[PDB]
Design an enzyme around this catalytic site. Sequence first.
Site: not given
Lengths: 210, 217
Positions: A88, A130
């Site tokens: 992440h 992301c």
Amino acid sequence: TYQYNMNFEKLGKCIIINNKNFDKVTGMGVRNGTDKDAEALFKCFRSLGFDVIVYNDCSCAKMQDLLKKASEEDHTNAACFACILLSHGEENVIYGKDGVTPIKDLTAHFRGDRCKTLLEKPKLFFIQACRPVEADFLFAYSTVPGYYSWRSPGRGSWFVQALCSILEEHGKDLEIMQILTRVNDRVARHFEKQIPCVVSMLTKELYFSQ
Amino acid sequence: RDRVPTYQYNMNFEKLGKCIIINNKNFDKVTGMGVRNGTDKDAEALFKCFRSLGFDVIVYNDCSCAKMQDLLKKASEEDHTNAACFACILLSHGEENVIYGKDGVTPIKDLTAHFRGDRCKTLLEKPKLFFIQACRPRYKIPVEADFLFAYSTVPGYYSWRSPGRGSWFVQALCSILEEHGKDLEIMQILTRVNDRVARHQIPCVVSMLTKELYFSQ
């Protein structure tokens, strides 16, 4: 003359940090597929000639130590250094399993000075996350951390798929920028959003061959 | 190594494209910014250089912030249908994410946004090049394909605009373009520029390009 000298014993080390399960206290669920991406990446890069090692669910400590320790190694007979991060991400920050650590701090260690042995040699960072501008560094993002990067639960990210496919077939004949550009096009063509981003401070053409 | 691929940007158009050069040399006192001696030398080498590649270059000087925004916006509202690409070169003072006008500071990201796919459909699928020499990382850039940013100095450090020789980056860029502009691929040219500048500060290139870019054949 206009190329990075690959005439070395080893091609180089390739650390693949693969964070999939992040501690709840972070608020980031499992990354189902990163296991698919990772294995793909492992083969692809091992296939290019990298001494690749995969590290799973690393904390900001593990990730920092890893990069720290690696930079400290002796890369004399090494042609270059490659690091692949999968997790992440946000504004120039990558997620550990127990929090967040700044990308800049991961690459810091390999700066011209902090890593004499990799000086003059390419440092490559492929970041898929992301939500340090020194010579001979190259960054390839699956897409900026803010804009979302499309995956596929049991198929992996388009970036990784494209990158492994292209590298699989042209990793030996195309220059690094050509490959990444094709990865760009391929990821782009999926939507027909998300576009990968390459940042290059490279001073020579890069070829994983000869 | 280089050859015949559908991996090249289609360059078969009426014209190569427009090349806007903003040459900010003088800045209002209030901004505290100094005169950028040597910028005219970059501006002249750059205009000749791109004129020579086949670009229809336009050169603006000592522009205001409102002027820069307006100029680029209007440029994005024109019909680039018969153009292969688009180039914009900014020569001024810089700071994290912003570039100086004479009257103040404006975000580079907004200056470039004018050309995003959804706002300049006539440049869609066409390379939009921005060479930025903002004396004084992917962040000050549109999340759109076919964009290329070549930042003069470290988007964290300072470039050395030589007193009366022109900034190192620019001069290097022009040098390499004179020599190989019509025979090297864009990333090849900028990579050499990187080396050249470094053999003297390191410039950085952010590419969202989806094809190879050759200015000729």
